[PDB]
Amino acid sequence: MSLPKPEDVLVAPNFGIQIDGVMVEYLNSVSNLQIEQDVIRYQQNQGTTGRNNVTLMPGVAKDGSVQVERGMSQSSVFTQWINDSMAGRMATARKNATIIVMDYEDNPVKRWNLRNAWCSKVVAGTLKAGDTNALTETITIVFEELVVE
Amino acid sequence: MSLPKPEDVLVAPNFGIQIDGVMVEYLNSVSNLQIEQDVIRYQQNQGTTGRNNVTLMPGVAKDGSVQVERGMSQSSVFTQWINDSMAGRMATARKNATIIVMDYEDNPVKRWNLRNAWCSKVVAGTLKAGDTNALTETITIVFEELVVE
Amino acid sequence: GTSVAAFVGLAPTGPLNEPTLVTNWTQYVAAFGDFTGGYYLAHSVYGFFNNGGSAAYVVRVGGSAQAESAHPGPAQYLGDSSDRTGFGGLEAIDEISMVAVPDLMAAYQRGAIDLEAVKAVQLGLIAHCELMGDRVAIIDPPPNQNARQIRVWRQETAGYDSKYAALYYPWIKSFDPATGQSRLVPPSGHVAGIWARNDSERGVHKAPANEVVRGAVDLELQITRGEQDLLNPIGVNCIRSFPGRGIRVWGARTLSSDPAWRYLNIRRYFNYLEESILIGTQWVVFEPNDHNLWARIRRNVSAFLVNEWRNGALFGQSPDQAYYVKCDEETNPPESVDLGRVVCEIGIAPVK
Amino acid sequence: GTSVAAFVGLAPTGPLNEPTLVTNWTQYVAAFGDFTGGYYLAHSVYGFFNNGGSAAYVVRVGGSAAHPGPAQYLGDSSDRTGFGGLEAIDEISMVAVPDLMAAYQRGAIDLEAVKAVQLGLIAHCELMGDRVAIIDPPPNQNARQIRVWRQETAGYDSKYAALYYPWIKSFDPATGQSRLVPPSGHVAGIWARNDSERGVHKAPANEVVRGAVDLELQITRGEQDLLNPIGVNCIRSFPGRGIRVWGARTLSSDPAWRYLNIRRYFNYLEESILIGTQWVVFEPNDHNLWARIRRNVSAFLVNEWRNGALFGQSPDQAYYVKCDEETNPPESVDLGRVVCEIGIAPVKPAEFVIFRLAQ
Amino acid sequence: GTSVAAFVGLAPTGPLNEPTLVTNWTQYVAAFGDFTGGYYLAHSVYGFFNNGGSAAYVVRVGGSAAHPGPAQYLGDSSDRTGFGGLEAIDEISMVAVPDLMAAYQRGAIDLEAVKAVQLGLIAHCELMGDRVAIIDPPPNQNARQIRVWRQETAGYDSKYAALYYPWIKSFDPATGQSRLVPPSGHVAGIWARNDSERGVHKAPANEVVRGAVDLELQITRGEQDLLNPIGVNCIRSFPGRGIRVWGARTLSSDPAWRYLNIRRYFNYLEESILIGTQWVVFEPNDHNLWARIRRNVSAFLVNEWRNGALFGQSPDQAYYVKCDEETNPPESVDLGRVVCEIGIAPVKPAEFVIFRLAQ
Amino acid sequence: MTRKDPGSSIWFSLAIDGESLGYFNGCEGLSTQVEVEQRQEGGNNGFVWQLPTRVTYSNIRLTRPLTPDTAKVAKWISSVQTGIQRPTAQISALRADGSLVARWGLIDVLPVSWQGPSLDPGSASVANEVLEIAHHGFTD
């Protein structure tokens, strides 16, 4: 924002959700605001098949945005979230959510206000005996209503 | 857990299945906490098609782990496990299992308890006369209920 | 449920001056008895349980068969200057929506409480109710006024003019299977139950007036519509019978003279809005004000309002005229940051 | 390794008052009684392990299941008999004195002698810095009595103490009956959880008080408003949720240290530095040693700022370290190097205001 | 850091005339009143915040809820009482004097003394260039009356002025009734939004005038054709759309500076340079110094040309920068360096014509 | 509101009382119908009058995995010769929390058909015996 041609940087994610956050968060790689279309092959009078008329649909949700908490530390907060949704208890699993984006300098500018978080998937990385990278506890979060802003 | 964000370097697996162990066990593939969603399309009196409701479903389980015991030595426990399930005898083939994740120093920090193991697949690596990289006796283990913790 | 009643008065003493919870009439009997002594608490509760109702808090200040005044008998109690016993003890509950004082008016027609005490006691209820900011008061009317006495009485004798009080003019004659007799019961508890049933199904969203008073038998007077438009503008509500519909409750107007909050539907709605927000807004002693708090509060409240508008309980073609939530630097300058942040919100409600 | 508590009280069996213990829960019953008698020590240590946290130090005192007064709680150079023997261990981060008021309940102690222990304990805790004192008020009191008791009878006005007014109706499995106990043990448990869950920085309030079934005297927004300005915490029940600790304030009249966590957080800073600057053997009595002192302190602090516990858009305004010649005179005396520190603490809010309207 | 605005009027409570304030809307009520009385100042700035933009400088004038005449609006070297005290701030980019004509409506001012303030404002605004003065015409005037008034009685013919003929029926929530106010405040809001949205080079017209519910007197294409050549803007309502500001011209008779944005844009260019060439301490009183001032100007302008706001197919034929020895002859005096500048402005349109036929 | 308590079609509870039939695994076809009679007024074109006439409860097909306790069902069905018994059934739909959303109880049941397992060497599935159930009314 300081310059007259800012475009953000990949290094500014953070998020505040009512379940406890973690120190380092490597990724979050899906953020969609999809709405589909139609096809009407409307005919006038003179004979043309007409333009492909298109209309407006639901803002289809289900844009789970996979998150990657780099490192399955002793913090079992994520696996406690899913273990609730599995057994129900939707009063504490249907969590509101947010995603924060910061500038070239760390200050929020745009926030992707979610509306219903679910955490419907927890997948761990391969336990190769000899590789070098870390362990990724990838989380997939599902929505009820699409993101806002 | 020594530092604020030391995570979990992937070189620390070991199984705990009831059948006899293995010295190497030089891989351990994807494990999941799978659970997908449902879809309702409810609309309020206002007229909007409304946010698509997403309710719940059963924990799908059937998680398949491709445990790779690098090297088919004389240890035939893996091929005794499947050959046991070929004819039946659930008394000795339905053995619960445990995957242990160890700390940066070799101590256990998190354990993925498996409620039921099956060993429904054993596949040998290709035997190219002139190649390298040893033989892999890859195992696929199926569940009845998803992992815990 | 979130509709919880609490009314006090004379009864066969159990836990004297201690708000206790009753969830079923089979539990209420197991704490006082059954209609002994002619006290009106049992009738009000039984009508409340028979006519809807989920739970209630009761304080048995009186006793079954010595003195009646503002302090003793069926009237207020400031907690013996501790404000944690009796009438003042209810301030230590914060889980009420409507409050009645039914058995107070036995004293007018049984003892020598006189009329000036009633004006003082009920006003004490109104000030207490307004102070908590979430409980509306159901006020019982004088007994056996015909058409013009109560119109003069309300506007000249004890003009209350509060935003948390509603009236119900005619009494209700209720019979008991136990005693096989019909006693003229104050018109509260019966209506207090109507509020409980109304919000649960019709939605709090709508003033619970137009409904049948289950448990009733008859009324002392049949208020014809000739004086109805003579009585509604001054704020009183009339329970009148109808040809083939039953004993229905007519009237959704409060005691306030302010035109903005003159409707009972609007005022009950905001109490539910504030109460649900209070549960929604937490981490009072969270951490630091920062910036995160301002956006977190703004998102959480709006997420709760937008869903509410989708149910139709808010007026507006699009979810913009429904509300306007602002939590920015133009609301919390650094001066108020040193103490505590603020926020603004609006909801628009209809009525007919 | 975490918050380490410290309790005193009468316990049936085990070591006598002279030593100090490091027990967990089931180690405690193997070393002390199980709720036997109306001794509040066992109740307090049970909730402490029930409300999260470990490393609890228990000290036996006179009676051992007495008439302690001030005699059976301070020994000074004798290294025994209570707080005098507690100076021997630096691992303690907080202290608590439950079951002291159980003696007052049975009598033979007198109220005017009760303040002798508390004031002596506070002076002891304030003596060695890295310690926060916990006080409990006399039972059977109303809103007026506690304000009268705090301000005119026991106006401690100390910087290292906290007060929690309403008591707790805990449970005693030995007889299957509830009991009213002081909340020192259960409050001390929260400080362990809070510090280990969201960081010590965040003030330990609005955390569910586990194990407590019912309170004693409900507190209203109409009456807490008198207590908070004079600085006493309150415990109240919130319908729709659980019983949660409110306020989190200290008793000092100093506006600088009004909030509780700042004192708690500054204790965390003091302990962290001490175990990281151990060059007290004074071998390199040299003027260039301050390079390591300055480096090993700022490097640790800037890591804490990356967390965000401190305040400041950049590490410049986050802290201010200085250990060069300016603060180190000639000082031919072996008086150690002098270091200047500051950590700009975060000022937490405690008032929520919402402005309705009807357009 | 944006179009900072200046206002003058009477406000009930707050600081007196001596200081000049910086404000946002919630600070306004915390520092001054809320529409109390028929004081047009409160109405003017409410729309200014409503019509986009911030950083509004208000100046309290005597009367404070008076008969200011031409005295209360001028303070000269006293640095007080209106325009005299406005010279102390360079952040201002625009000025406006609402509620001045409220005094004329109430009387005791007289029309002949009204021109004293506006002409004095024009001299004050021209005294340092980097500001544009906004003027408002007498209310309840017709098309004939305004033309005679502008040309015969108040022929200002200044280069830093803007005139907006019809007033606005704004709203006053305090009394629940509409009111007729001068449009200086709401117009000053548009110039803030325009520059902040489409760039300051685009002339601030055809932008919706937010907050205005109704006008006073409609303007037709049959009568604006008289007013536009003599340089007065018009506000009119377009059915099928909202109320939009039309014309956006200036009151100077110079054909070079007829269009408003050129004066607005040249202020933006002049202000931007001043921030970038602050070497006034004259330390490097050197001939090679001005090489940098030529670089730091052309580098900035060529970026503006990439934005496409300067006419010209290339950086050449777009700007004109020259700071060689010919423009800095050896005067041996410290008058300072000399810069030759020009930016070829875009020739803005005002008319739309469409031809038709039926073949 | 509490974000509502929406219905679902996975969590349920299917049971038959009486004979030790136990708990079943899948319902179908639970339905109530009326038999309207259409009388067409001659002199008024535009519609046919609709008049209600009786109600009728349709059959229900219940399925479950073929467990060794299927001997009870065959015993129940083949008890018609010596006297049958109508126990009282239940069909309840639940949310994953285990709470109740709607509970229907069949007043009196009666076996109609029992389609046994469909053994097939090539199809990988699990045998699902089907027990059709006759009906007498809902309970309240």
Side-chain angles (χ1 to χ4, degrees):
Chain A
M1 180 60 59
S2 61
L3 296 176
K5 184 177 181 179
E7 75 292 336
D8 271 30
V9 202
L10 289 205
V11 283
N14 205 70
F15 30 96
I17 61 197
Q18 283 64 0
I19 209 64
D20 193 358
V22 192
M23 171 75 267
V24 65
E25 291 60 51
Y26 211 62
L27 263 206
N28 37 75
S29 34
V30 163
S31 287
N32 299 44
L33 305 81
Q34 197 177 359
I35 182 179
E36 70 285 40
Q37 321 85 317
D38 310 71
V39 153
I40 292 199
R41 304 309 195 102
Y42 192 89
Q43 241 75 340
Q44 303 64 9
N45 75 14
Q46 66 54 17
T48 198
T49 198
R51 54 212 310 130
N52 272 346
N53 155 259
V54 281
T55 50
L56 314 101
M57 342 311 276
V60 64
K62 201 200 281 217
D63 166 24
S65 63
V66 172
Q67 191 133 350
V68 176
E69 181 213 1
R70 173 157 165 233
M72 42 176 50
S73 100
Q74 48 101 19
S75 158
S76 73
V77 54
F78 268 127
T79 191
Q80 193 74 0
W81 196 0
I82 170 55
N83 205 286
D84 273 351
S85 158
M86 256 199 226
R89 271 180 295 211
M90 301 315 307
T92 82
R94 230 174 274 260
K95 289 257 148 268
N96 195 306
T98 320
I99 284 189
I100 281 177
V101 177
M102 301 136 277
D103 313 328
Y104 222 124
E105 192 295 349
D106 325 288
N107 269 203
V109 49
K110 251 176 88 163
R111 330 160 154 279
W112 294 90
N113 270 333
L114 317 185
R115 206 33 77 74
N116 249 20
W118 211 0
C119 173
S120 98
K121 182 102 134 162
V122 171
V123 50
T126 85
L127 290 201
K128 185 68 188 160
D131 273 357
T132 62
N133 40 359
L135 257 193
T136 43
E137 168 157 62
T138 281
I139 322 281
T140 285
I141 294 185
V142 189
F143 299 146
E144 157 197 36
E145 148 70 55
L146 274 180
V147 317
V148 200
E149 295 187 33
Chain B
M1 60 181 60
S2 60
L3 298 179
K5 40 58 181 179
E7 57 270 339
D8 267 328
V9 202
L10 42 69
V11 202
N14 197 101
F15 51 54
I17 316 149
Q18 303 313 0
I19 62 87
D20 189 4
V22 157
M23 152 65 58
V24 278
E25 172 284 348
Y26 258 45
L27 201 137
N28 174 327
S29 150
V30 285
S31 35
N32 298 69
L33 300 310
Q34 192 180 1
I35 179 178
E36 334 169 18
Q37 82 204 80
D38 274 47
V39 153
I40 330 181
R41 312 312 305 252
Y42 200 97
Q43 81 306 356
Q44 298 65 11
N45 85 28
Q46 203 287 321
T48 53
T49 203
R51 37 193 64 176
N52 37 6
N53 240 24
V54 284
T55 39
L56 273 198
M57 86 210 269
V60 47
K62 316 187 49 181
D63 184 4
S65 60
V66 178
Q67 220 149 355
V68 169
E69 175 211 12
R70 183 174 161 213
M72 21 167 69
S73 77
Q74 290 127 1
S75 147
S76 50
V77 282
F78 272 134
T79 186
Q80 200 73 18
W81 201 358
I82 171 65
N83 203 290
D84 191 316
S85 151
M86 298 258 256
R89 302 182 278 225
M90 289 323 89
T92 85
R94 242 186 260 260
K95 326 198 81 51
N96 87 19
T98 302
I99 278 173
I100 282 180
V101 167
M102 271 155 288
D103 158 14
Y104 207 123
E105 192 295 348
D106 315 282
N107 269 20
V109 83
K110 253 180 84 161
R111 332 162 154 276
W112 300 76
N113 273 345
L114 325 175
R115 203 36 58 77
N116 261 256
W118 217 22
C119 186
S120 99
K121 214 173 181 73
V122 55
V123 47
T126 169
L127 312 197
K128 189 169 154 189
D131 199 70
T132 66
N133 314 1
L135 259 53
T136 42
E137 192 175 30
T138 297
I139 313 288
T140 283
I141 298 191
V142 200
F143 297 147
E144 150 184 8
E145 201 257 352
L146 280 138
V147 305
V148 198
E149 277 178 42
Chain C
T2 212
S3 43
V4 203
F7 29 71
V8 313
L10 256 57
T13 281
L16 179 131
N17 275 319
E18 161 57 350
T20 63
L21 178 95
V22 278
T23 174
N24 193 356
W25 201 89
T26 186
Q27 303 263 81
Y28 176 49
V29 52
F32 99 96
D34 35 13
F35 317 98
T36 86
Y39 306 123
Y40 293 169
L41 186 65
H43 303 340
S44 277
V45 170
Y46 172 56
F48 182 88
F49 270 107
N50 157 83
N51 166 77
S54 181
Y57 278 132
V58 296
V59 160
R60 307 151 145 92
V61 52
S64 54
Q66 335 177 49
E68 306 169 336
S69 175
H71 182 268
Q76 75 145 286
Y77 182 19
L78 66 144
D80 259 353
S81 305
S82 66
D83 285 284
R84 261 83 187 210
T85 56
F87 210 49
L90 288 205
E91 308 182 49
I93 292 310
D94 77 87
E95 192 35 80
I96 323 286
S97 266
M98 77 303 287
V99 174
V101 55
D103 318 335
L104 165 150
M105 282 276 268
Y108 201 91
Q109 52 174 178
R110 220 172 186 159
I113 194 60
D114 279 357
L115 190 102
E116 268 336 290
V118 158
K119 146 150 204 169
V121 174
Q122 288 185 331
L123 264 164
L125 203 158
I126 276 190
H128 151 274
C129 261
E130 180 260 1
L131 202 50
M132 286 328 77
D134 45 332
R135 46 206 63 208
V136 286
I138 296 163
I139 300 199
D140 318 333
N144 320 323
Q145 272 76 6
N146 42 359
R148 286 169 204 168
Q149 276 167 319
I150 201 174
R151 177 227 174 70
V152 163
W153 169 86
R154 176 249 175 264
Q155 240 195 332
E156 306 269 43
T157 278
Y160 298 113
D161 187 16
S162 153
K163 266 197 321 197
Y164 300 104
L167 223 54
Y168 292 100
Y169 158 64
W171 289 46
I172 280 177
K173 153 136 52 182
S174 88
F175 92 112
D176 260 302
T179 54
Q181 295 299 336
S182 71
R183 142 88 47 81
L184 272 309
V185 159
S188 183
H190 293 325
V191 46
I194 274 177
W195 295 23
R197 156 162 85 262
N198 189 78
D199 60 1
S200 62
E201 298 182 1
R202 308 292 50 262
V204 161
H205 151 52
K206 186 46 31 178
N210 199 28
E211 208 87 10
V212 46
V213 178
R214 294 183 178 91
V217 154
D218 226 1
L219 312 102
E220 63 212 346
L221 321 181
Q222 293 91 325
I223 319 318
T224 165
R225 95 174 274 149
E227 64 268 359
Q228 195 67 12
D229 214 9
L230 194 54
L231 251 53
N232 249 16
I234 88 164
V236 78
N237 289 358
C238 328
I239 297 186
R240 57 189 309 214
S241 43
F242 268 96
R245 328 258 325 285
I247 310 104
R248 292 195 165 270
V249 157
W250 235 248
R253 204 151 290 92
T254 85
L255 257 177
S256 156
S257 67
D258 226 356
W261 276 275
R262 65 191 187 166
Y263 271 104
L264 181 58
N265 177 50
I266 320 295
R267 159 61 30 193
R268 312 194 46 251
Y269 197 21
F270 272 72
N271 305 319
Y272 162 77
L273 257 193
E274 174 132 39
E275 203 79 0
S276 192
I277 279 295
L278 275 203
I279 300 311
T281 279
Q282 269 324 275
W283 46 91
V284 161
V285 197
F286 190 87
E287 197 179 2
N289 260 146
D290 56 62
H291 289 90
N292 309 343
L293 266 283
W294 299 350
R296 153 157 313 171
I297 277 295
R298 157 169 30 124
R299 165 201 93 232
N300 230 307
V301 155
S302 190
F304 162 67
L305 289 205
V306 56
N307 160 78
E308 186 100 354
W309 171 89
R310 304 265 197 78
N311 267 41
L314 269 282
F315 150 77
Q317 49 242 54
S318 147
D320 164 50
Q321 315 114 34
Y323 44 63
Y324 154 77
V325 196
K326 161 140 209 196
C327 210
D328 270 7
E329 301 196 353
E330 208 92 343
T331 41
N332 320 262
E335 293 88 340
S336 280
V337 170
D338 321 302
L339 320 177
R341 84 301 181 271
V342 308
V343 84
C344 316
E345 92 294 9
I346 321 94
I348 312 326
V351 80
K352 152 34 51 178
Chain D
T2 88
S3 92
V4 202
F7 318 111
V8 295
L10 317 84
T13 81
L16 185 91
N17 71 329
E18 152 204 18
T20 54
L21 292 323
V22 72
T23 179
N24 60 72
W25 160 251
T26 199
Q27 211 171 11
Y28 164 80
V29 281
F32 304 95
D34 37 16
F35 299 120
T36 59
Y39 305 89
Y40 299 158
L41 165 65
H43 278 118
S44 35
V45 86
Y46 182 70
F48 180 82
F49 295 115
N50 217 51
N51 280 240
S54 98
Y57 270 66
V58 57
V59 153
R60 174 98 65 76
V61 283
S64 183
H67 50 53
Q72 294 324 301
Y73 286 128
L74 309 94
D76 311 75
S77 93
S78 72
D79 269 34
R80 312 140 61 171
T81 79
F83 315 136
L86 250 202
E87 273 150 6
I89 283 156
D90 195 21
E91 201 146 30
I92 293 304
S93 95
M94 62 182 171
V95 84
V97 48
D99 156 54
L100 155 57
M101 309 252 270
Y104 166 64
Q105 259 173 33
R106 95 207 194 216
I109 312 295
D110 177 285
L111 184 134
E112 267 284 350
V114 152
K115 65 149 161 41
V117 172
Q118 285 162 137
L119 248 179
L121 159 81
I122 274 166
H124 153 251
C125 95
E126 205 167 346
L127 192 129
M128 52 154 52
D130 45 16
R131 183 159 319 202
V132 184
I134 276 166
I135 318 158
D136 38 359
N140 162 12
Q141 283 182 178
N142 59 15
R144 299 185 329 276
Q145 278 159 314
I146 179 60
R147 155 168 217 152
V148 165
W149 177 89
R150 182 257 201 284
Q151 199 45 263
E152 310 97 271
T153 307
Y156 306 140
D157 204 353
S158 151
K159 211 195 295 164
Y160 285 17
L163 204 42
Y164 296 81
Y165 164 60
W167 269 21
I168 287 203
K169 186 169 272 157
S170 147
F171 187 60
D172 178 4
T175 48
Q177 297 311 130
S178 305
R179 190 177 309 286
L180 295 193
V181 314
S184 288
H186 287 65
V187 159
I190 297 318
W191 293 9
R193 215 164 39 160
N194 183 354
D195 304 2
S196 59
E197 268 216 344
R198 314 191 51 251
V200 50
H201 42 271
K202 148 83 148 39
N206 207 285
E207 305 259 35
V208 185
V209 177
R210 291 188 175 184
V213 285
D214 200 313
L215 269 195
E216 157 165 336
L217 196 43
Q218 276 285 112
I219 262 62
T220 72
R221 202 192 166 150
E223 283 290 355
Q224 185 203 296
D225 42 8
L226 297 167
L227 302 187
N228 264 133
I230 77 176
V232 52
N233 291 356
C234 318
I235 290 192
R236 28 188 308 199
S237 193
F238 279 53
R241 300 221 312 293
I243 323 166
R244 318 193 148 208
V245 162
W246 236 239
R249 274 214 196 175
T250 62
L251 329 175
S252 158
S253 84
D254 231 2
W257 313 85
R258 153 186 332 123
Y259 290 126
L260 151 73
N261 67 335
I262 324 289
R263 154 64 35 214
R264 296 221 61 252
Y265 187 40
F266 266 82
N267 266 10
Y268 177 57
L269 261 302
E270 283 297 271
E271 215 287 332
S272 278
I273 299 315
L274 256 51
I275 81 162
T277 68
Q278 296 287 355
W279 337 109
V280 297
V281 300
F282 290 92
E283 295 180 355
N285 285 333
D286 156 45
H287 94 277
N288 285 335
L289 190 47
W290 328 319
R292 293 205 314 238
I293 276 151
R294 186 168 9 107
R295 151 180 82 168
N296 284 1
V297 156
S298 163
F300 157 62
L301 261 201
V302 79
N303 159 244
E304 195 125 345
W305 170 84
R306 217 209 167 190
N307 179 301
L310 306 108
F311 159 71
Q313 95 293 343
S314 90
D316 165 326
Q317 296 144 246
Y319 50 88
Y320 168 65
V321 77
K322 167 192 243 316
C323 203
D324 66 55
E325 160 274 350
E326 283 192 279
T327 195
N328 255 34
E331 55 96 22
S332 273
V333 48
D334 86 308
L335 245 183
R337 350 278 188 183
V338 152
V339 63
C340 215
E341 90 305 356
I342 193 59
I344 308 304
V347 278
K348 97 173 305 180
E351 275 89 354
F352 60 101
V353 164
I354 297 200
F355 278 172
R356 85 282 174 259
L357 164 154
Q359 92 198 308
Chain E
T2 304
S3 97
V4 202
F7 291 80
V8 154
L10 317 85
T13 88
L16 192 83
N17 57 279
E18 176 194 16
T20 67
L21 280 298
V22 51
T23 312
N24 268 36
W25 165 254
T26 311
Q27 333 191 15
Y28 186 24
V29 283
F32 312 91
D34 38 16
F35 301 119
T36 56
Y39 295 88
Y40 299 160
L41 167 66
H43 286 124
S44 46
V45 86
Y46 181 67
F48 176 83
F49 290 123
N50 229 55
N51 282 244
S54 94
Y57 270 62
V58 72
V59 160
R60 150 86 79 80
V61 190
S64 178
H67 51 53
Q72 302 300 358
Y73 295 118
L74 302 167
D76 321 64
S77 93
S78 67
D79 271 41
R80 289 146 78 189
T81 51
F83 311 149
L86 217 53
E87 271 148 8
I89 287 300
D90 194 24
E91 182 96 20
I92 285 293
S93 166
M94 72 193 340
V95 83
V97 193
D99 158 35
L100 156 60
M101 306 254 278
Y104 162 65
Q105 262 200 304
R106 102 202 188 213
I109 314 292
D110 190 5
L111 190 134
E112 276 290 350
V114 157
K115 69 167 179 323
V117 171
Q118 308 179 356
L119 251 183
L121 178 74
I122 288 320
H124 165 229
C125 95
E126 290 215 22
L127 215 41
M128 81 205 168
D130 53 4
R131 57 172 50 198
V132 184
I134 275 158
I135 330 179
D136 42 358
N140 59 275
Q141 300 272 327
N142 54 60
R144 264 181 310 101
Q145 275 176 326
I146 183 57
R147 153 166 220 158
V148 179
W149 175 89
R150 185 256 198 283
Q151 208 55 265
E152 150 167 19
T153 57
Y156 298 148
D157 204 354
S158 151
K159 213 191 301 169
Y160 296 175
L163 204 47
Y164 295 85
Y165 160 65
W167 274 23
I168 280 186
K169 204 172 271 163
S170 148
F171 189 56
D172 179 1
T175 49
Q177 293 310 132
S178 298
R179 195 178 306 286
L180 269 307
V181 305
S184 81
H186 289 79
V187 157
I190 299 317
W191 297 17
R193 209 167 37 160
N194 181 358
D195 305 357
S196 180
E197 270 211 350
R198 303 267 329 272
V200 80
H201 70 269
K202 149 98 142 45
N206 203 273
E207 301 266 40
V208 201
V209 177
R210 283 298 189 92
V213 301
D214 198 312
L215 271 198
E216 164 164 321
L217 189 39
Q218 207 81 201
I219 276 69
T220 45
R221 200 188 173 157
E223 294 284 4
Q224 187 209 114
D225 37 10
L226 300 168
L227 309 180
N228 237 329
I230 74 176
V232 71
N233 295 340
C234 315
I235 291 194
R236 56 186 290 192
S237 190
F238 282 61
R241 277 229 307 253
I243 328 172
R244 320 186 145 224
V245 163
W246 229 239
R249 269 214 196 177
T250 204
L251 299 58
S252 161
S253 89
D254 231 2
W257 309 80
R258 151 184 333 122
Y259 290 113
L260 162 72
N261 68 331
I262 326 287
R263 157 59 35 203
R264 299 224 59 250
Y265 185 44
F266 263 87
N267 265 358
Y268 175 63
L269 249 57
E270 186 163 39
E271 208 284 335
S272 275
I273 297 318
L274 289 196
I275 306 309
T277 88
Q278 297 280 24
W279 337 109
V280 289
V281 302
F282 292 90
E283 291 180 358
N285 281 334
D286 155 47
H287 95 86
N288 277 317
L289 160 73
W290 64 61
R292 274 199 328 242
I293 82 165
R294 176 172 19 102
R295 150 180 89 167
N296 281 359
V297 156
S298 165
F300 162 59
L301 274 198
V302 75
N303 160 243
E304 204 103 23
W305 167 85
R306 214 206 173 195
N307 209 285
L310 298 167
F311 170 63
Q313 90 297 338
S314 90
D316 183 346
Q317 320 165 222
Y319 46 87
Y320 187 23
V321 48
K322 145 169 210 80
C323 200
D324 62 35
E325 57 86 32
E326 171 113 354
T327 202
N328 261 33
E331 311 282 357
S332 278
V333 78
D334 288 24
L335 255 182
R337 334 289 177 200
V338 157
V339 278
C340 207
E341 103 293 330
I342 220 76
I344 316 294
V347 283
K348 208 254 197 154
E351 280 87 358
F352 66 104
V353 307
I354 295 200
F355 289 170
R356 252 147 163 155
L357 170 151
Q359 66 170 350
Chain F
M1 166 176 283
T2 69
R3 283 134 185 161
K4 308 163 49 180
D5 316 301
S8 210
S9 90
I10 298 167
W11 334 98
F12 50 51
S13 174
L14 276 177
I16 306 280
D17 201 329
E19 291 56 10
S20 173
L21 314 181
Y23 293 74
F24 278 154
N25 188 253
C27 169
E28 251 288 344
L30 161 71
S31 46
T32 89
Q33 323 164 30
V34 315
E35 289 154 37
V36 290
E37 166 105 325
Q38 293 151 300
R39 152 67 52 143
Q40 38 199 320
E41 162 46 36
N44 171 25
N45 312 353
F47 58 88
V48 183
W49 284 74
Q50 308 293 79
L51 326 161
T53 278
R54 204 157 329 114
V55 317
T56 302
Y57 294 140
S58 163
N59 284 21
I60 310 189
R61 318 174 52 94
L62 293 164
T63 85
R64 79 162 155 195
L66 174 56
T67 207
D69 282 357
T70 193
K72 295 313 171 322
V73 152
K75 180 50 176 142
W76 183 34
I77 272 182
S78 200
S79 98
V80 177
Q81 326 169 311
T82 197
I84 208 165
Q85 308 262 34
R86 334 281 283 282
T88 291
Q90 93 162 37
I91 299 181
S92 56
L94 311 185
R95 339 178 191 97
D97 297 335
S99 299
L100 169 147
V101 86
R103 166 164 308 174
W104 300 290
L106 320 189
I107 275 297
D108 273 296
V109 288
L110 170 36
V112 172
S113 84
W114 169 71
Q115 301 264 330
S118 80
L119 308 191
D120 224 328
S123 272
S125 82
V126 287
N128 257 332
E129 74 166 356
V130 166
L131 176 88
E132 264 186 277
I133 281 314
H135 216 156
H136 264 203
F138 287 165
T139 196
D140 207 293

